[PDB]
């Protein structure tokens, strides 16, 4: 929740065969929890040796192509699958449906540690950029740069050092390389007040969500209502439905050192706003905070406006 | 008393269905079994059906088709911060999809009629007013009926996951992790699926289609959901969990959450005379839809001002952002920008969508190759703002039109200051 | 000749009237039983009464084979099957009358074909 | 000790999609501007040539069923009528740290697995497995049906470090056999590069281009797609090809499966050739499965009797087990 | 021993899309800069000419349906008014390795299938099939309806070795027949080349160019496409033609059918022209089926009578079985 000292920009990042579905009720862009977990894994790989911290992300989505098809005059979509290898016999028995997507994302990470205190500026960015090219960001591999016009522009932009007009010039210089993207930010307060708006009959949050992202057509007693923005439903963290357990208690855990919980997704609201329409870039960083007393394990973006 | 005065017809439904498949010796044996277990022994059949399969409210079978683990149906209630919505508060319409080990569908369909207006569907766990006299037998039959009716919410007890069941790691602030194993919210998924079905096609859906098409007009909360994908569970044989019925063949469909430009690519203003020579064009398909939306309800009223304070400037901001996004998308994947046949106006007015430096540049190439400012861009933006909104000679009688004009002038000045730094 | 083959020959061909030439009825009315004379009768009625006289065992099997093969060669008009599967290629095409051709419908073997046949009906 | 109930290995050596473009054989070196091969739609009409049933083939019924032919609209990818060769380009990154499990339930079994894998790496280095991967990078197996009938298939693979070509190569894919693995000096240098990448240092990065002189406007074959619901209307489409940005491409797992056909130690045959490395090695083209649990030569029992009971297998089967760990899986 | 549950052959004779351009005769040697035959879109007005089924055969209903015409907008392809010959160009590559399946279930079946095909090949090679394919190349049958009424067809068959044309053939397609497969002194080199390509020795890729002198500004017939004509407006597209990058063309499988129209061994009549090598050899024009499976002369009977039961057919029918293996598909289930 701490404001960072620096916004280390990860560049144009083509990632292929991602997870499109990412939630039991959405199918579009992958979850932002994947991005916060990706930054925490990158921290566990490079930041302990670099003596820094890495907390937030800026999810911009320069381009996005799903592996879908619109089957033969229908208003829906279906998912392109992949043929799996055979069983002990030649059955092709099980076909579980999971989607894929190719997205060119570019993250901006909030640094906390000894960035300029004990280390240089370009070398830390070079190390983290050549470290993030040997891992996967959403369920699919991070494709490297082999095409022409070799960028490598890991801008390790300092934020708290400099005058105010120079700082605003640095923000509007970093926003120049976010040129065709679209930042994703949570709008929990917007969903709350939109729930209080239509609380006349029954104020269910899952009904205010499922009647806002659509196009609600309603004539004159002949129009559609004015689109307030690019509102999407996103997974906004998990919610436990079973108490805490011991490490070696629950059968077939991923590891027997950390406790287990049986959880369930929470569906929040999100917007794809242009990066020019934010004051500072550090306003749109995704952090995941947890309250282990109750069951809420929520990722969100504080200071989103 | 919903055990003999009310459950008699429910028990005799089975003894009437056992008369349809009537045989000489096997039919008499089936009728004898139905008479032994349906005259007073309904508690024993209810105990067998309760022992047969488990009751799930969120089952983790749908995440891997060959994953045999624990699927607990606990309450997902999360009363915390006011920004989260999930399966935590259903209350009504919380259909418990019992799909653990369903080999006989008549297990859960034994006492599904005495709860609609009776006190036995809630007395099927504790406080047995008719729990001892419903069977009408001794303590053995009533005890078997009670132990079977408790098994509709009796979990396995020992928690268990699988190696194919999506166990992730959540990091705490300065502590050890918590491993989270999400399960598939079957009751919530079928609640939202019933919402989508009864909003997409049905009875009031077709009537609302008629109220949209013809002269008859009834505006209400009917909508069309675009771009929703289909994810099928089970495939050819959907027996993962129940509620995958005959037209619900794993057919859980997913709400659209795609990116802002999650469609394909398209443009019409390339480096040419018909594309870039047009010094004031200002067009796009998505920007055209946004302009039609912003120009449809293009008034400034007094009772509509409480929403038109933001719904009018929001459209102009979206139009400016769409123009900036089109200008950024045009000059990124088209390196051709130089002298050529039909590229005269693509050097002065094309200061925004202009290419990089050339191969035969001169010494003072900061004016004849790429001027360091959007010199023709500001007048073009002013003309586009004047043409997109038909301002009249009485459009400043109050501050409603003049405020939009001042906002358009400020947005044009901001876009000019942004585009001035483009050539550097 | 088999027995369900005669049932499918009864089931699949078009219902025609006055299709029996003089030699066929001349052989048939003396060949079949003394019950019904088949003059200007539809194919379904003749085939149903001959299959019934084959069921309630009065006439032999070789006579029924000859007369059902005679009803096979006397008719050249077939009903359209609405669903034709490509077996090795594992596909299912569906008849579209305005194209007079079998347009593609779905990937599927014989079980999917029988499912579609049970749903939509086996003929056009 | 018992087997870990959650065992999984990340995929090493994952390739990108293999995008296809087209141009002449003379300008194969100035080929960064070659136009892509788009997929197009074309309608095909056919009679019944299937092996129809042994009962419903009556004389008049076949002539009645032949009068109505079956129609469809397939997708095709053809070279343009001036271009002569097909260029297939992808980027393969070899991650490294092969035997490290992504998820391991037991800790002692994890330590024993790491000790067994380090024992294998110390005893015999990765030169054999990296040579068998350098063969599939060298002879262009990754163009599956675009290879047969071409008169000149040659690959240009360059290892890049930080955005610049650090070491380049050139092979002749028709001269190198698809059947037998026989070495060469440049193949051993490339195998040393791949084996140094497969050690736990970090990813090594190759750009793999393959030019096949397939013909002057012929048909090229990118990978198809599973849809599993073609639609309920008139206008379905039987064959649909794969495209990324209107360029016909080969799937990434298709390229991975072409890179993984290295094992020739399966017991049932000795002249078929290598199959892909898979637990219970099952060719999807043939439709059967070698290395079944009837014999004791699958991956699962091999791993169990190698790391638990310390019963070290034959050197071919140890090569197979470590190639299966390089491939990755979920157990 | 039974047939395999999967057994599939690739096609060993691959043509491209035969794309057509236009020009003037006697300048057809310097004919690599000819303009393409573009597919224009004209408007037709048809009238009722189908058979009435004595329900609308009334004096007033026919007069009421005559006055309501059938307006359509069809594609059309024509030569320009200054061009009087049609040049149709494609490339055919002969792969070879004919009887080797691409995906076979059983090994004991495919080994003896390879044994029977090898016994055929070393007993009597692909020279008969290559002679008939070289006749369907020299006699320009791949111009399907662009050949009827043409004044003079002329085919040029190169042999593109490595970009360089190694060998050239020039045939007068109307001098040699379309029915009788007689041998020529020049055609035997092309038949030897296709036999060497099918037998495995070498890579054979030919460039076939056919000039058909139609007439000044006449009509050419490219391949036609499928339309899902659900509902039509005032004038709606009722016929569209094939076009690869704004240039008319014949489909690759329609100029492949006219290459394997070699079957003249069918039992009905060998004097009514050759037909296409197909299992239950059929022609949708004639609407019948030569090689009926009630007879023992189809492909799917002679195949498993030759491989399984080892009853070797007549010498003229082994050519048909091997030619159907060259065509391809999945056999056996």
Tell me, letter by letter, the H, E, C secondary structure of B316-383: HHHHHHHHHHHHHHHCCCCCCCCCCCCCCCCCCHHHCCCCCCCCCCCCCHHHHCCCCCCCCHHHHHHH
**Torsions phi, psi for B5 (to 5 deg):** -80, -15
Query: What does the block give as tokens for E296?
Result: 């023992």
In chain A, whose CA is at the least distance from the CA of D244? A65
Of B257, B258, B210, residue with least CA distance to A210: B257
Does the CB of B163 have a partner CB in chain D at under 8 Å? Answer: yes
Contact B163 D229 (CB under 8 A): no
Contact C101 D71 (CB under 8 A): yes
Of D262, D148, D154, residue with least CA distance to E102: D148
* Secondary structure (DSSP) of D33-98: SPPB--EEEEEEEE---S---SSS--HHHHHHHHSS-EEEEEEEEE--SS--EEEEEEEEEE---T
Of A279, A29, A300, A32, residue with least CA distance to A191: A300
Contacts of D235 in chain E (CB under 8 A): 228
Does the CB of D7 have a partner CB in chain B at under 8 Å? Answer: yes
Residues A186 and A241 in one domain: yes
Residues 210-229 of chain D with CB under 8 A from chain E are: 213, 215-219
Of A29, A5, A4, residue with least CA distance to A15: A29
Of D7, D277, D253, residue with least CA distance to D128: D277
Angle formed by the axes of helices D127-138 and D315-327, to 10°?
60
* Secondary structure (DSSP) of A163-210: -HHHHHHHHHHHGGGS-S--EEEE-HHHHHHHHHHTTTT---HHHHHT
Contacts of D331 in chain B (CB under 8 A): 163
Kindly state the DSSP code that residue B4 receives in the 8-state scheme: T
Contact D330 B164 (CB under 8 A): yes
Is D137 within 8 Å of D190 (Cβ atoms)? yes
DSSP bridge pairs for A300: A287
Residues A29 and A162 in one domain: yes
Contact D70 C102 (CB under 8 A): yes
In chain A, the number of structural domains is 2
Of D179, D170, D171, D190, residue with least CA distance to D129: D190
Nearest 5°: CA angle at E240, between E236 and E242? 160
Closest to C88 (Cβ–Cβ): which among E226, E229, E330? E330
Place of tokens 């350098």: D134
Residues A163 and A36 in one domain: yes
Query: What does the block give as tokens for B395?
Result: 């459009």
Residues A118 and A41 in one domain: yes
Helix, strand or coil, per DSSP, at residue E323: helix
Is B57 within 8 Å of B73 (Cβ atoms)? yes
Contact C88 E229 (CB under 8 A): no
Q: Taken in order E76, E81, E82, E86, is the CA torsion positive or negative?
A: positive
Query: What does the block give as tokens for E4?
Result: 């395999």
C-alpha A295/C-alpha A244 separation (Å) is: 9
Q: How many helices (H) and strands (E) does chain C have?
A: 5, 3
Residues A115 and A249 in one domain: no
Residues A254 and A187 in one domain: yes
Contact B229 A79 (CB under 8 A): yes
E-only strand ranges, B126-204: 168-171, 177-182
What's chain B's length in residues? 424
Residues A100 and A236 in one domain: no
**Phi-psi region at A252: left, alpha or beta (left = phi > 0; alpha = psi -120 to 50):** left
Domain boundary among A155, A181, A207: A181
Query: What does the block give as tokens for E331?
Result: 């056999």
- Whole domain around residue A148: which residue ranges? 4-181
Query: What does the block give as tokens for B231?
Result: 């994810």
Residues 6 or more apart from D18 whose CB is under 8 A from it? Answer: D88, D89, D90, D142, D143, D249, D250, D252, D254, D255
Residues A57 and A114 in one domain: yes
DSSP bridge pairs for A54: A111
C-alpha B159/C-alpha B69 separation (Å) is: 8
Query: What does the block give as tokens for A62?
Result: 């320069």
Of A100, A260, D11, residue with least CA distance to B165: A260
DSSP bridge pairs for A265: A238
C-alpha E289/C-alpha E272 separation (Å) is: 14
D and B interact (at least 3 Cβ pairs within 8 A): yes
Of B188, B114, B99, residue with least CA distance to B152: B99
Residues A13 and A145 in one domain: yes
C-alpha D207/C-alpha D196 separation (Å) is: 17
Place of tokens 């029954």: A202
C-alpha B123/C-alpha B111 separation (Å) is: 11
Residues A219 and A105 in one domain: no
Alpha helices per DSSP H over chain D: 59-66, 107-123, 127-138, 185-198, 252-259, 300-307, 315-327
Domain boundary among A181, A213, A248: A181
Kindly state the DSSP code that residue D201 receives in the 8-state scheme: T
Q: What is the number of other CB atoms lying within 10 angstroms of the CB of residue A270?
A: 28
Residues 6 or more apart from D158 whose CB is under 8 A from it? Answer: D165, D166, D167, D168, D169, D206, D207
Domain boundary among A153, A181, A209: A181
* H/E run at residue A231: strand A231-240
Residues A40 and A121 in one domain: yes
Contact B232 D5 (CB under 8 A): no
* H/E run at residue E205: strand E204-212
Does the CB of D75 have a partner CB in chain A at under 8 Å? Answer: no
Residues A118 and A12 in one domain: yes
In chain C, whose CA is at the least distance from the CA of D70? C102
C-alpha A276/C-alpha A295 separation (Å) is: 36
C-alpha E181/C-alpha E265 separation (Å) is: 12
Q: Looking at chain A, which subunits does it touch, using at least 3 CB pairs closer than 8 Å as the criterion? A: B, D
Is B231 within 8 Å of A97 (Cβ atoms)? yes
Contacts of D41 in chain C (CB under 8 A): none
Contact A215 B317 (CB under 8 A): no
Contact D58 C95 (CB under 8 A): no
Of E313, E288, E287, residue with least CA distance to E300: E313
């Amino acid at each position: 929740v701490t404001d960072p000292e620096a916004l280390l920009l990860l560049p144009r990042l083509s990632i292929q065969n991602a997870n499109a579905i990412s939630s039991p009720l959405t199918w579009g862009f992958p979850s932002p929890g994947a991005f916060t977990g990706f930054v925490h894994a990158l921290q566990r790989r490079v930041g302990i040796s670099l003596d820094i911290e890495l907390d937030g992300v800026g999810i911009v989505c320069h381009r996005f192509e799903a592996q879908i098809s619109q089957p033969a005059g229908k208003r829906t979509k279906v998912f392109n699958l992949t043929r799996n290898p055979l069983n002990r016999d030649g059955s092709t028995a099980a076909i579980v449906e999971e989607g894929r997507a190719h997205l060119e994302v570019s993250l901006l990470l909030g640094v906390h540690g000894d960035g300029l205190d004990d280390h240089p500026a370009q070398e830390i960015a070079r190390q983290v950029q050549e470290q993030a090219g040997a891992m996967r960001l959403a369920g699919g591999s991070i494709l490297p740069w082999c095409n022409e016009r070799f960028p490598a522009p890991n801008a390790e932009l300092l934020m708290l050092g400099g005058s105010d007009e120079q700082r605003r010039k640095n923000q509007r210089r970093l926003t120049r390389r976010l040129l065709p993207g679209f930042a994703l930010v949570s709008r929990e307060a917007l969903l709350q007040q939109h729930l209080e708006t239509l609380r006349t009959t029954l104020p269910e949050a899952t009904t205010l969500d499922a009647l806002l992202d659509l196009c609600r057509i309603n004539f004159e007693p002949w129009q559609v209502r004015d689109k307030p923005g690019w509102l999407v439903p996103i997974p906004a963290g998990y919610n436990a439905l079973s108490p805490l357990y011991l490490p070696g208690e629950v059968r077939n855990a991923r590891d027997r050192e950390t406790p287990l919980r049986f959880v369930e997704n929470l569906f929040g609201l999100g917007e794809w706003l242009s990066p020019h329409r934010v004051a500072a870039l550090s306003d749109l960083l995704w952090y995941h905070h947890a309250e282990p007393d109750k069951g809420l394990y929520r990722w969100s973006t504080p200071r989103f406006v | 008393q919903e055990l003999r005065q009310f459950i008699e017809s429910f028990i005799q439904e089975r003894l009437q269905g056992k008369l349809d498949k009537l045989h000489p010796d096997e039919d008499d044996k089936r009728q004898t079994l139905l008479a032994t277990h349906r005259r007073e022994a309904w508690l024993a059949d209810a105990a067998r059906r309760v022992g047969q399969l488990q009751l799930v409210t969120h089952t983790l079978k749908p995440i891997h088709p060959d994953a045999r683990g624990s699927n607990l149906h606990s309450l997902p209630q999360a009363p915390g911060q006011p920004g989260l919505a999930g399966s935590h508060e259903l209350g009504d319409r919380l259909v418990s999809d019992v799909v653990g080990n369903a080999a006989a569908l008549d297990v859960f369909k034994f006492l599904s009629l005495q709860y609609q207006g009776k006190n036995l569907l809630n007395w099927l766990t504790e406080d047995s007013a008719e729990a001892v006299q419903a069977l009408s037998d001794n303590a053995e039959q009533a005890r078997e009926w009670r132990q079977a009716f408790i098994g509709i919410t009796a979990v396995k007890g020992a928690p268990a996951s699988h190696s194919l069941a999506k166990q992730l790691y959540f990091p705490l602030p300065g502590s050890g992790y918590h491993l989270l194993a999400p399960l598939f919210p079957t009751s919530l998924v079928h609640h939202v699926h019933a919402l989508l079905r009864e909003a997409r096609f049905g009875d009031a859906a077709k009537a609302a289609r008629e109220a949209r098409s013809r002269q008859e007009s009834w505006p209400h909360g009917f909508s069309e959901y675009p771009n929703l994908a289909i994810q099928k569970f089970g495939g050819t044989k959907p027996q993962n969990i129940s509620q995958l019925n005959s037209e619900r063949y794993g057919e859980n469909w997913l709400l659209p959450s795609l990116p802002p430009h999650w469609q394909r690519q398209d443009q019409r203003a390339p480096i040419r005379h018909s594309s870039v020579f047009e010094h004031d064009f200002g067009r796009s398909p998505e920007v055209s839809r946004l302009t039609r939306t912003l120009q449809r309800l293009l008034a400034k009223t007094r009772h509509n001002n409480f929403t038109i304070r933001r719904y009018r400037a929001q459209l102009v901001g979206q139009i400016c952002d769409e123009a900036l996004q089109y200008a950024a998308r045009l000059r990124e994947l088209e390196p051709g920008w130089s002298a050529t046949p039909g590229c005269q106006l693509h050097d002065a007015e094309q200061l925004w969508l202009d290419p990089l430096r050339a191969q035969t540049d001169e010494t003072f190439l900061q004016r004849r190759l790429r001027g360091d400012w959007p010199a023709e861009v500001g007048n073009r933006f002013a003309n586009w703002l004047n043409r997109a909104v038909s301002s009249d000679s009485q459009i400043l009688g109050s501050p409603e039109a003049a405020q939009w004009s001042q906002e358009l002038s400020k947005e044009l000045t901001m876009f000019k200051e942004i585009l001035e730094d483009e050539r550097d | 000749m088999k027995k369900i083959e005669m049932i499918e020959i009864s089931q699949n061909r078009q219902n025609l009237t006055a299709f029996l030439h003089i030699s066929e009825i001349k052989a048939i009315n003396a060949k079949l039983a003394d019950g019904v004379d088949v003059d200007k009768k539809s194919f379904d009625e003749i085939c149903s009464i001959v299959l019934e006289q084959y069921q309630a065992k009065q006439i032999s099997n070789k006579q029924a084979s000859e007369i059902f093969e005679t009803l096979a060669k006397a008719n050249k008009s077939f009903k359209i099957e609405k669903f034709r599967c490509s077996h090795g290629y594992n596909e299912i095409y569906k008849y579209s009358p305005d194209h007079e051709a079998y347009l593609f419908y779905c990937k599927g073997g014989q079980g999917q074909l029988n499912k579609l046949i049970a749903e939509n009906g086996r003929f056009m | 000790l018992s087997t870990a109930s959650v065992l999984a290995f990340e995929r090493k050596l994952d390739p990108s999609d293999a995008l296809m473009s087209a141009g002449a054989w003379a300008q194969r070196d100035a080929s960064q501007e070659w136009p892509a091969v788009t997929v197009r739609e074309k309608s095909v009409r056919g009679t019944i040539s299937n092996r129809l049933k042994t009962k419903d083939r009556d004389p008049a019924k076949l002539d009645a069923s032949i009068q109505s032919p079956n129609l469809q609209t397939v997708d095709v990818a053809n070279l343009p009528s001036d271009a002569d060769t097909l260029k297939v380009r992808f980027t393969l990154r070899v991650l490294g740290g092969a035997g490290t499990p992504s998820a391991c339930n037991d800790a002692a079994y994890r330590d024993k697995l790491l000790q067994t894998v380090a024992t294998y790496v110390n005893e015999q280095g990765f030169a054999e497995l990296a040579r068998r991967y350098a063969h599939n990078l060298a002879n262009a197996r990754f163009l599956w049906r675009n290879r047969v009938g071409a008169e000149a298939v040659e690959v240009r693979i360059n290892h890049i470090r930080q955005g610049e070509v650090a070491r380049t190569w050139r092979f002749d894919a028709l001269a190198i056999g698809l059947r037998d693995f026989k070495a060469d000096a440049e193949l051993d240098a490339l195998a040393e590069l791949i084996a140094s990448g497969l050690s736990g240092s970090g990813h090594v990065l190759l750009e793999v281009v393959a030019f096949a002189r397939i013909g002057d406007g012929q048909e090229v074959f990118p990978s198809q797609e599973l849809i599993l619901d073609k639609g309920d209307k008139k206008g379905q489409k039987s064959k649909t090809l794969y495209s990324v940005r209107d360029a016909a491409a080969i799937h990434s797992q298709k390229i991975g499966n072409a890179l993984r056909t290295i094992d020739t130690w399966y017991p049932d045959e000795d002249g078929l050739g290598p199959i892909a490395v898979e637990p219970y090695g099952s060719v999807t083209s043939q439709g059967k499965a070698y290395r079944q649990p009837k014999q004791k030569l699958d991956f699962y029992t091999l791993l169990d009797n190698w790391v638990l009971r310390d019963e070290a297998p034959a050197v071919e089967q140890q090569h197979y087990v470590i190639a299966n760990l390089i491939r990755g899986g979920v157990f």
